[PDB]
């Protein structure tokens, strides 16, 4: 192999610019890093900065450098879809036609309907909420009536909060599980179907660890079922292997925070293994881009981006850094959906003792797949082009 390990991360959200697709999506204008550095009045990102991101595109604080420490460039997302699944499913290898859907005026009729039809229950709020705003409205209706408490997030969720005195947990889960086959629909299509088990007393609600995910599986084997296939290591740290459903990963690390994730990264560089470590830093996404909040996304780039030193120092000869990301969420863009945005490419070895240079435009995002299969020598994906030897 010409790497021994590759370090995947994806910094959740971290767009670099409106991608040529952008119109259909209604996201012209739409700039996630460069939203953010007018915001700051320039970002601090000097390691960001010396691995080549200002190369990529120069941004308020974020200028171009004379000789980056690795390889630069930008992806274009080819499948339909701009959510956090497609944009994965993509990076590892795959192509996907139907798009993930999201529903900020709540659930149609006809799928409520449905779900109501054949569980015996009731479907109570129906809109977009936090856990905690859901329960404070309609815990104790739903706690006296048994209905369930349907809602949804900005991401594409669909989630089901009952009283674990009311609604046995198994019950909650069966029910979870209708939804998540009725949601298997391109009309209602939802990444995740999420039970969201509550116990307490109206104005003292609280969810319960007994949450449950319900998700797909990638619509193909991905470049991942391939490494654990080959016996290869493929440590997921994060959201990763929930956003794969598991599918070739070998360990899994939870992780709590952006920091953490960091720290969790630090782990596996401390860890001897061949094959894959993949970091998803989420918060960007689900604190920052959704939320519109610039100020609060500029702050944890910055953070971010200060940790990176120690990953430098840490990084053997014979391991490649990958960072990118999987679509944009600009936090001064209307509503509160992602959007269809170029994603950085920055692919950084201590090997390249001469430092890096501009890569073609990478045209799907399964590059970066087809790029680990070529290194660890298993079956090619279908989609992308491997920039590896370019390296
Ligand atoms: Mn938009
Ligand atoms: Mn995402
Ligand atoms: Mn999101």
């Not at 404070?136 to 089901?160: F, K, N």
């Not at 660890?376 to 992308?384: D, L």
Request: glycine content about 10%.
């Amino acid at each position: 192999n010409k790497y021994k390990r590759i370090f995947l991360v994806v910094m959740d959200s971290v767009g670099i610019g409106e991608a040529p697709d952008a119109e259909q999506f209604g996201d012209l204008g739409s700039d996630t890093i460069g939203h953010i550095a007018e915001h700051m009045n320039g970002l601090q990102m000097p390691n960001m900065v010396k691995l080549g991101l200002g190369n990529i595109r120069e941004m308020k604080g974020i200028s171009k450098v004379e000789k980056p420490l690795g390889y630069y460039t930008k992806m274009q997302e080819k499948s339909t879809g701009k959510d956090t699944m497609t944009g994965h499913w993509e990076i590892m290898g795959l192509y996907i036609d139907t798009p993930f859907q999201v529903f900020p005026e709540g659930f149609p009729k006809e799928l409520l309907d449905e779900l109501e039809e054949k569980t015996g229950r009731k479907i109570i709020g129906n809109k977009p909420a936090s856990g905690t705003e859901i329960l404070d409205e309609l815990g104790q209706e739903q706690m006296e009536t048994g209905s369930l408490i349907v809602y949804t997030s900005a991401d594409s969720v669909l989630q089901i909060a009952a009283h674990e005195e009311v609604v046995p947990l198994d019950e909650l889960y069966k029910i979870c599980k209708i939804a998540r086959e009725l949601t298997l629909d391109e009309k209602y299509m939802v990444g995740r179907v999420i039970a969201r088990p509550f116990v307490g007393e109206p104005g003292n609600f609280t969810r319960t660890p007994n949450r449950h995910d319900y998700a797909l599986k990638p619509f193909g084997r991905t470049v991942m079922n391939e490494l654990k296939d080959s016996d290869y290591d493929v440590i997921a740290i994060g959201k990763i292997s929930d956003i794969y459903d598991g599918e070739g990963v070998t360990e899994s690390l939870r992780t709590k925070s952006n920091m953490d994730g960091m720290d969790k990264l630090v782990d596996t560089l401390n860890m001897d293994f061949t094959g894959l470590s993949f970091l998803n830093l989420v918060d960007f996404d689900a604190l920052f881009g959704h939320r519109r909040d610039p100020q609060g996304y500029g702050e944890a780039l910055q953070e971010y981006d200060a940790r990176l030193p120690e990953v430098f120092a840490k990084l053997k000869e014979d391991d490649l850094l990958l960072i990118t990301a999987d679509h944009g969420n600009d936090p001064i863009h209307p509503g509160t959906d992602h959007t269809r945005e170029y994603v950085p490419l920055l692919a950084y070895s201590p090997s390249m003792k001469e430092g890096g240079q501009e890569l073609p435009l990478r045209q799907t995002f399964a590059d970066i797949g087809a790029t680990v299969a070529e290194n660890f020598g298993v079956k090619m994906p279908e989609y992308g082009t491997s920039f590896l030897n370019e390296l």
